[PDB]
Amino acid sequence: DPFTMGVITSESEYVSSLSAEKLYRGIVEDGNIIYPKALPRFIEKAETLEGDGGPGTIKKLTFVGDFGSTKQHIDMVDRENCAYTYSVYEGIALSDQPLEKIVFEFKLVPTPEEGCIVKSTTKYYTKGDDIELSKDYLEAGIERFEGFTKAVESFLLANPDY
Amino acid sequence: DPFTMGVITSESEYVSSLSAEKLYRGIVEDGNIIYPKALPRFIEKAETLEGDGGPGTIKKLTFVGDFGSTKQHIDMVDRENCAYTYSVYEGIALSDQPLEKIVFEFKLVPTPEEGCIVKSTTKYYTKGDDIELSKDYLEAGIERFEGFTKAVESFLLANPDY
Numbered sequence A, B: 001d002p003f004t005m006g007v008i009t010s011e012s013e014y015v016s017s018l019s020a021e022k023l024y025r026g027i028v029e030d031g032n033i034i035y036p037k038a039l040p041r042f043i044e045k046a047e048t049l050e051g052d053g054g055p056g057t058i059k060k061l062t063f064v065g066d067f068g069s070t071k072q073h074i075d076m077v078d079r080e081n082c083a084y085t086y087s088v089y090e091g092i093a094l095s096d097q098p099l100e101k102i103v104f105e106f107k108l109v110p111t112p113e114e115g116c117i118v119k120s121t122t123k124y125y126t127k128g129d130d131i132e133l134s135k136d137y138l139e140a141g142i143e144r145f146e147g148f149t150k151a152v153e154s155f156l157l158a159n160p161d162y
Ligand SMILES: c1ccc(CNc2ncnc3[nH]cnc23)cc1
Pocket: A061, A070, A071, A072, A088, A102, A104, A137, A140, A141, A142, A144, A145, A148, B064, B065, B066
């Protein structure tokens, strides 16, 4: 009768033209104003429910439309190294596979040629005794996460006055 | 002390290469298999909860990710004229403006040159005594609706074996 758990990691990278510090400040420090400006058709509202922005903080995205809302629980905030981690605990099941949580993580690494390399990771933690997860689902999470980051980067470039 | 209600309509059109009857059959008759194939990163599951497919039927979309699920209540089904209408009643509020319902409507009109003209309409019905709705929200609904139709059309063209 063993105890079983899966951790499934997806990693994706891309090179941003925006500097690491600006991209970091935008998402992590000004998320509450920038998320709805950069994704005005998808994110209706980004707000803080508990805490000051550091580890332990609970933030909340409300989506435009009949897509609900979701809470982010903030795990690591590292300004010096432009690194951010949070967890979502609710509404994360697939129609077949329950999840204990999803963890989202980025590190922005400054490059000379450009702004920075954006390193994004998603980790799905599985509830239960077996595992079934499809390419499309695994890729959807990483693709959405990286998309939020991309939209915030386009916004800040088109609007340096932030 | 009057009774006040707003009906806000958005209409959008585009020309499909796929014939009206194929596009209609795909969404309305085979939605349960085609929605998750055409939008495999967004729609996890499309299923019928009540009824046989005609007016009165309650269908349900489950979204990929922490985006919830939503029910469609089917109002008009017109195979002859390729016309379909349904309503969503739940989770439709904006952060400022409550809605009584959202109605979605398409008519596909066959053209000689191509497949058909896809006419899409969204109607937002407002709960309350005043009205505040922004360009971005109004456009998001119509854009999503028309997007579902576009994804189903690309799929059926790339896969005529359906
Ligand atoms: C699978 C898993 C996740 C997603 C998209 N959710 C998501 N992505 C990124 N950041 C978030 N904060 C709250 N929810 C999210 C899509 C598919």
